[PDB]
Amino acid sequence: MNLTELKNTPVSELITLGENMGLENLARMRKQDIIFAILKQHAKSGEDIFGDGVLEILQDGFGFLRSADSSYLAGPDDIYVSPSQIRRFNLRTGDTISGKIRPPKEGERYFALLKVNE
């Protein structure tokens, strides 16, 4: 289960996929909400979830994995990457990165990179 793959799937299919995972009344929800729910769900079942994008490092030192669809401009599905990850892995703006991710925790709004390229 990849965030980019879910993002490129038809809403109707995401709905069937989601309800087959115990989710309810997705038929009347926004595709973006359905994806996040499907991903948080799959995660709660003990499975790994993935994501990817082209890294953009911000002035302050943290970054986000941007997506071509959003035209590489800040989007709700951006993947957060810590200054520590950038530092330890010698990452740079422009790098194509893929990896396991986790839904946001209390206080966060975006999915976070769990392990880089792993």
Are both 110 and 52 inside the same structural domain? yes
Instruction: Tell me if 112 sits within 8 A of 79, measured CB to CB.
Output: yes
Residue 10 corresponds to which tokens in the numbers above?
């038809």
Q: Are residues 52 and 32 in the same domain?
A: no
CATH of the domain at 95: 2.40.50.140
Which amino acid is located at 36 in the chain? F
Look at phi and psi of residue 78 and say left if phi exceeds 0, alpha if psi is from -120 to 50, else beta: beta
Instruction: Specify whether 12 is located in the same domain as 22.
Output: yes
- Residue 33 is which amino acid? D
Residue 97 three-state SS: strand
CA atoms of 70 and 51, how far apart (whole Å): 15
| Strand-pair partners of 116 | 99
- Residue 86 DSSP SS3: helix
Residues 17 and 60 in one domain: no
Q: Where are the beta strands (DSSP E) in 1-118?
A: 49-57, 63-66, 79-81, 96-102, 111-116
- What residues pair up with 79 in beta bridges, in sequence order? 65, 111
Domain count, the chain: 2
In the block, residue with structure tokens 């595709």 = 31
Q: How far apart are CA 75 and CA 69, in angstroms?
A: 9
